[PDB]
């Protein structure tokens, strides 16, 4: 839904890296190089940014009830 | 059937009354007997 | 082998065998009308028990055009000598006893079918 605050496996902060990852992707970095530029060296964090589905952008398309 | 055998009526209706009473008693004991209509509710579900 | 049916000519129906002892011969006498007919062949009922050796009349030549049927080049035709042939098996219950290949010539207008 939204990027997890921490990596599940180790606990590295990955919640501050989703928008940076998207900005690096639209700067035509490859995904491996974008992950390497963010300091995610263990594959447990690379799956955390790599496999993320950001559903909250589509939940914000619905007009707020409250 | 008590009324139609006390307030006297013809045999052609007392026979139907006897047949229907026999059907009701049998379907009280045995509803799943074949060859006869099933005892049914107003919802159409058969009697237990 | 098998002897066919005989048909009446007047009432368009079947004939039936009968033995007239006046000439002591066999006639095909219809029993809807009074039509009679002498018989060329004396065979009335005939049965085949192990005489199922001829599967070739049931095969039609059209099966040469089947894309799913297997083609071979090692069995050339005897009639026209074409290299291509299609090979299959006889698929009846009376051919479960055999796995004999029946071949049909692939070339158009030939239609020759054989075995082995």
């Amino acid at each position: 839904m939204i990027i997890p605050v921490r990596c599940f496996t180790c606990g590295k902060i990955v919640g501050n890296k989703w928008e940076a990852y998207l900005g690096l992707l639209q700067a035509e970095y490859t995904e491996g190089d974008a992950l390497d530029a963010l300091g995610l060296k263990r594959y447990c964090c690379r799956r955390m940014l790599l496999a993320h589905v950001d559903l909250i952008e589509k939940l914000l398309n619905y007009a707020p009830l409250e | 059937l008590r009324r139609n055998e006390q307030n006297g009526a013809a045999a052609h209706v007392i026979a139907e009354d006897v047949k229907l009473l026999q059907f009701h008693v049998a379907t009280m004991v045995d509803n799943e007997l074949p060859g006869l209509p099933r005892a049914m509710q107003k919802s159409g579900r058969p009697l237990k | 082998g098998f002897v066919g049916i005989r048909f009446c000519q007047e009432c368009n129906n079947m004939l039936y065998p009968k033995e007239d002892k006046e000439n002591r011969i066999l006639l095909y006498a219809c029993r809807n009308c009074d039509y009679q007919q002498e018989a060329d062949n004396s065979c009335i009922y005939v049965n085949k028990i192990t005489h199922e050796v001829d599967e070739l009349t049931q095969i039609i030549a059209d099966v040469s055009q089947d894309p799913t049927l297997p083609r071979t080049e090692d069995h050339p035709c005897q009639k026209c000598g074409h290299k291509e042939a299609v090979f299959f098996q006889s698929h009846s219950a009376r051919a479960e006893d055999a796995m004999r290949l029946y071949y049909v010539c692939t070339a158009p207008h030939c239609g020759h079918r054989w075995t082995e």
Partner: protein, 1131 residues
């Protein structure tokens, strides 16, 4: 330019992406409903006979052009409004559109002209509209327009909303109609039988089946008889031919036996001729048939009329239902007898019941058409009864009073709501499960349920033949996705590119056949039949043709360019038996295949280039269909094609298998369905594990739909952090799985650690779970309405005070507001009250009927929605939100059938770690792999390690030579890991290296709905049942567990008689009765005054106290109700 093999994977996935860009996944439901609405309803209305009522003046009622509105809601004020689907879901409204018909009433009077009255647009009922079809309000809307309506653009549609409940129509596998099928009856009086489920096309009427059977040997020979419809005995077939108007024998045998040099056919028709010799005239034959009908006749004329109408309108209706059609019906009956003779001689082979060439699929279209046919017949019956009741005495009838609009509306609503398909008054004989509540647990559940087929076969059948995976399911039906248990092999799923034909008119094919040298049956001698190819169109023998090469090539050329032959028309040529069958009817399932001609694909690089820019050429899948490149092939036509699995099969080989390929597969991984296409490397798994994963990917937890906040679903499960898989197939792009994913990529070590993962269990990381790993929410919605039950019983949403309300469960009402409802944000517990409803009874005037929360369910009220239902009452729905943290006993599954429960949770410092400090999220047992043979799990871990190091998303499409274990191993070794995925793990407790090296890697695990807190149950004592006074049913009613008969047998074998008594007497239903010591019947016993009395004996001193189960007392009293005396003698 031919597509070179290095570009072929990209090319085939581009054309597959084009197919799934245009058609989509629920296209068959929407197409069937659209063709039902546009064509079938009007056909049913028009084909209904006009109502001709005469007492007298004569009234003719004719029905005309139908009109269907959009789905509208009428409130109690009567003002129409456009009904949106979320309003129907929230307010429990039926998403239906009103159906208006035009009626013409003509009056005929003695010595007076007609009087025509035009009731334009007469309301006759409401048709439930299927979501996202043509006549839905969401049709044609963009994604922004759908999000403004609080709808999900990913939601497929294809379902109905009945009373706020989403209902899907499961397709039903019927036998194919109008086709002669010959089977050898097992242990019957007939050796071979030939049936035809005959039904006239484009007319919804029930199929009339005619059997043409041949008797067993153990008379002279073999007799062919005919089991006609509505003729209750077996008419000999020659008598049927006589009754059709054929006195002669060359007439009958030219209709039956097409080649007269063939002797065996004659030797088998000889007993059938010679048994029916005594009947020689047409009307004599008609008398012989009509004497044994369902309604016999005392008059010969009545029997002649009966047999004439049976052979006119009931015996083979599809070939002809009209007069002068004796020759076409007689040729078809002769064809049936001919096929019977061919199969009995062994020359032809018996038909297969499980072959889907012999089966059609009733989708929403034909099923709703059958319903609407019956219900419109009911409506016309009601109109004729009302109008006849008036014109018996009254002058005239107003028609709008005669139109019972509840017939169509409530009948369609009932059948779509209950699933009992048919009429409510015959619900015991109605087929159930046709309509089902749409599964909304994840998106895979929704798609799988919307693409579901069902064999109408009893699930208690011990025969395996309909359950078998038949060979003809290739590419049409998923081979893996089927239920486990009693419905295995009966409930099925479509493959991805399988499309079910919607139906077409046979006519333009018939004019083309007329003007393409086909000689009609009505204008030929039978002697021309013996070497000509018969032509069947929708099972109707229409003629013969003498050049079948050019006819079949011409027909295929027309179909391949979207001419006269439409794309779904199936055209089979049976070469060996000289037949051409053309099927245009609905229910045929087909799939697109590439066309191979002269060992070359017709799909070339220009098509791929044009499809590469689908947005800016307006090139699509339909242009590929129009280009003669792809072709829709169904099951009977797939028996005559020669498929290439890949274009590599077209290449010349050193051992050439085939050089006459007719079609080629687009990609073989389109034999899988929706739920089996989530499995990475399905071909490396054992097939039971593929079936298990097809089952358990529907129970996984993810985000089931995007607008889950608007919806008040009874049960909803939402994962906190769903991830798309690192190891995906290319079919997962068209299932939208990377937008609504249903699992998390775990770090899984397959290790033996502490013993707590043995026998399918897993060990989870407590520290990972603390960070949100597999955390979820369970939403439960409760509905309650102020129902007005007459004048007295007025239930109202009022906050209950104990001073005025009775019948409470003695729970606090303080969390309720003063409007009688709880408010969002309040923590609730299993005893708390969320809705306060009070009913007014005729001090305690009010009785408390408050809605309580489910037992032991902690939660917080997420939403309260207050509205008016269709009846104008106040209606409320409360959604309660419970956060489910992963817990010991929660069921987690991978994508390979490696289900299990969490056996223990260790913290991060306790779980084993690699040299980088990577601890696994899940540890599974090694022993779960070997007998299971889920090598796809190991390869998924390896490929996920490679994909997480590389940054790619791994491709695991089933049949892909470019991906193999050695390639992935070399790739993993390129990142400084061991090539086979093993790592040196250290013990978390001691720090010491584990001697073995542990296979660890990212694997996609999914959390299943089967949580332990939703299943834990216990009882000491509590609610008992009303009748037998035994404990209740299920944990929802605080019930007890069943100590069934096998438990009794086990406790007998144990010898534990006192434990057997405790379970079966004390812990279930202890009871004491008083029994007369003389007669043994239970006796009256006033225990207050110690007055023990037995009538029937006048006994007052000899009465005994007997302890029994209450069910024993109930049994004995049922027996004494049954005029049986169990005389319980204590001596």
């Amino acid at each position: 330019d031919e597509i070179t093999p290095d570009l072929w994977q990209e090319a085939c996935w581009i054309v597959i992406s084009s197919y799934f860009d245009e058609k989509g996944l629920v296209r068959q439901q929407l197409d069937s409903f659209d063709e039902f609405i546009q064509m079938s309803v009007q056909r049913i209305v028009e084909d209904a006979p006009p109502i001709d009522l005469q007492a007298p003046p004569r009234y003719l009622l004719k029905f005309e052009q139908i009109y269907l509105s959009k789905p509208t809601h009428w409130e109690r004020d009567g003002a129409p409004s456009p009904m949106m689907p979320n309003e129907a879901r929230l307010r429990n409204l039926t998403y239906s559109a009103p159906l208006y018909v035009d009626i013409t009433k003509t009056v005929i009077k003695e010595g007076e002209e007609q009087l025509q009255t035009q009731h334009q647009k007469t309301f006759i009922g409401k048709i439930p509209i299927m979501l996202r079809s043509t006549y839905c309000l969401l049709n044609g809307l963009t994604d922004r327009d759908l999000c403004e309506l609080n709808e999900c653009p990913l939601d497929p549609g294809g379902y109905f909303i009945i009373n706020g409940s989403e209902k899907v129509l499961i397709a039903q596998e019927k036998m194919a109609t109008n086709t002669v099928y010959v089977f050898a009856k097992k242990d019957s009086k007939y050796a071979y039988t030939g049936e035809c489920r005959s039904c006239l096309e484009n007319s919804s009427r029930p199929t009339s089946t005619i059997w043409v059977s041949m008797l067993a040997r153990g008379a002279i020979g073999q007799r062919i008889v005919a089991t006609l419809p509505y003729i209750k005995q077996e008419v000999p077939i020659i008598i049927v031919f006589r009754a059709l108007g054929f006195v002669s024998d060359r007439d009958i045998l030219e209709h039956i036996i097409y080649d007269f040099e063939d002797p065996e056919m004659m030797e088998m028709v000889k007993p059938s001729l010679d048994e029916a010799f005594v009947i020689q005239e047409q009307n004599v034959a008609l008398n012989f048939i009509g004497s044994r009908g369902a309604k016999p006749g005392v008059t010969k004329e009545k029997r002649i009329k009966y047999a004439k109408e049976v052979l006119q309108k009931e015996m083979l209706p599809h070939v002809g239902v009209s007069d002068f059609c004796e020759t076409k019906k007689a040729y078809f009956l002769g064809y049936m007898v001919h096929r019977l003779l061919l199969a009995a001689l062994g020359r032809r082979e018996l038909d297969d019941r499980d072959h889907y060439g012999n089966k059609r699929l009733d989708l929403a279209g034909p099923l709703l058409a059958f319903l609407f046919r019956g219900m419109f017949k009911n409506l016309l019956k009601e109109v004729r009864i009302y109008a006849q009741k008036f014109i018996d005495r009254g002058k005239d009838f107003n028609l709008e009073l005669a139109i019972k609009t509840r017939i169509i509306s409530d009948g369609l609503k009932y059948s779509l709501a209950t699933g009992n398909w048919g009429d409510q008054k015959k619900a015991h004989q109605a087929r159930a499960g046709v309509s089902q509540v749409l599964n909304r647990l994840t998106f895979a559940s929704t798609l799988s349920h919307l693409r579901r087929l069902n064999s109408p076969i009893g699930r208690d059948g011990k025969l395996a033949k309909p359950r078998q995976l038949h060979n003809t399911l290739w590419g049409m039906v998923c081979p893996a996705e089927t239920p486990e248990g009693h419905a295995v092999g009966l409930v099925k799923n479509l493959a991805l590119m399988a499309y079910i034909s919607v139906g077409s008119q046979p006519s333009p094919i018939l004019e083309f056949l007329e003007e393409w040298s086909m000689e009609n049956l009505e204008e030929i001698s039978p002697a021309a039949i013996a070497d000509a190819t018969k032509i069947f169109v929708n099972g109707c023998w229409v003629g013969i043709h003498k050049d079948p090469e050019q006819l079949m090539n011409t027909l295929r050329k027309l179909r391949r360019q979207m001419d006269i032959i439409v794309s779904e028309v199936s055209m089979i040529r049976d070469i060996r038996e000289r037949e051409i069958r053309i099927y245009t009817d609905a229910g045929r399932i087909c799939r697109p295949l590439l066309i191979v001609e002269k060992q070359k694909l017709l799909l070339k690089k220009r098509h791929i280039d044009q499809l590469k820019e689908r947005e800016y050429n307006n090139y699509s899948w339909q242009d590929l269909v129009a280009s003669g490149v792809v072709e829709y092939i169904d099951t009977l036509e797939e028996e005559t094609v020669m498929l290439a699995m890949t274009p590599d099969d077209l290449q010349e080989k050193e051992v050439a298998y085939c050089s006459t390929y007719t079609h080629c597969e687009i990609h073989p991984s389109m034999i899988l369905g929706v739920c089996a296409s989530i499995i990475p490397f399905p071909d490396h798994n054992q097939s039971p594990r593929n079936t298990y994963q097809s089952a358990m990917g529907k129970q996984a937890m993810g985000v089931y739909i995007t607008n889950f906040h608007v919806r008040m679903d009874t049960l909803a499960h939402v994962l906190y952090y769903p991830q798309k898989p690192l190891v995906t197939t290319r079919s997962m792009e068209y299932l939208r799985f990377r937008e609504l994913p249903a699992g998390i990529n775990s770090i899984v070590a397959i290790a033996s650690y502490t013993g707590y993962n043995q026998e399918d269990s897993v060990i989870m990381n407590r520290s990972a779970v603390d960070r949100g790993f597999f955390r979820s929410v369970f939403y439960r919605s409760y509905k309650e309405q102020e129902s007005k039950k007459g004048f007295d019983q007025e239930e109202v949403f009022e906050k209950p005070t104990r001073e005025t309300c009775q019948g409470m469960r003695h729970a606090i009402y303080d969390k309720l507001d003063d409007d009688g409802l709880i408010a969002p944000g309040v923590r609730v517990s299993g005893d708390d009250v969320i809705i306060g409803k009070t009913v007014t009874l005729p001090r305690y005037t009010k009785r408390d009927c408050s809605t309580f929360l489910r037992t032991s369910e902690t939660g917080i009220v997420d939403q309260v929605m207050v509205t008016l239902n269709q009846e104008g009452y106040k209606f409320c729905k409360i959604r309660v939100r419970s956060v489910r943290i992963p817990q010991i006993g929660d069921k987690f599954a991978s994508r390979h059938g490696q289900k299990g429960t969490c056996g223990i949770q260790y913290r991060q410092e306790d779980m084993p770690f690699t040299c980088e400090g990577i601890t696994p999220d899940i540890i599974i047992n090694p022993h779960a792999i070997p007998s299971r043979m889920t090598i796809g799990h190991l390869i998924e871990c390896l490929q996920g390690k490679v994909s997480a190091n590389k940054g790619e998303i791994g491709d695991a499409t089933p049949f892909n030579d470019a991906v193999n274990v050695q390639k992935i191993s070399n790739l993993l070794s390129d990142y400084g890991y061991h090539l086979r995925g093993n790592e040196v793990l250290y013990n978390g407790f001691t720090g010491r290296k584990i001697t073995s090296q542990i296979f660890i890697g990212p694997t996609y695990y999914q959390r299943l709905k089967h949580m332990v807190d939703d299943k834990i149950h216990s009882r000491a004592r509590g609610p008992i049942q009303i009748l037998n006074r035994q404990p209740m049913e299920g944990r929802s009613r605080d019930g007890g567990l069943r100590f069934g008969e096998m438990e009794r047998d086990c406790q007998i074998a144990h010898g534990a008689a006192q434990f057997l008594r405790e379970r079966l007497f004390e812990a279930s239903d202890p009871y004491q009765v008083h029994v007369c010591n003389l007669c043994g019947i239970m006796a009256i016993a006033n225990t207050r005054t110690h007055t023990y009395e037995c009538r029937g004996c006048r006994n007052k001193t000899q009465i005994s106290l007997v302890r029994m189960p209450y069910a024993c007392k109930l049994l004995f009293q049922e027996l004494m109700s049954m005029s049986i005396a169990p005389r319980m003698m204590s001596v």
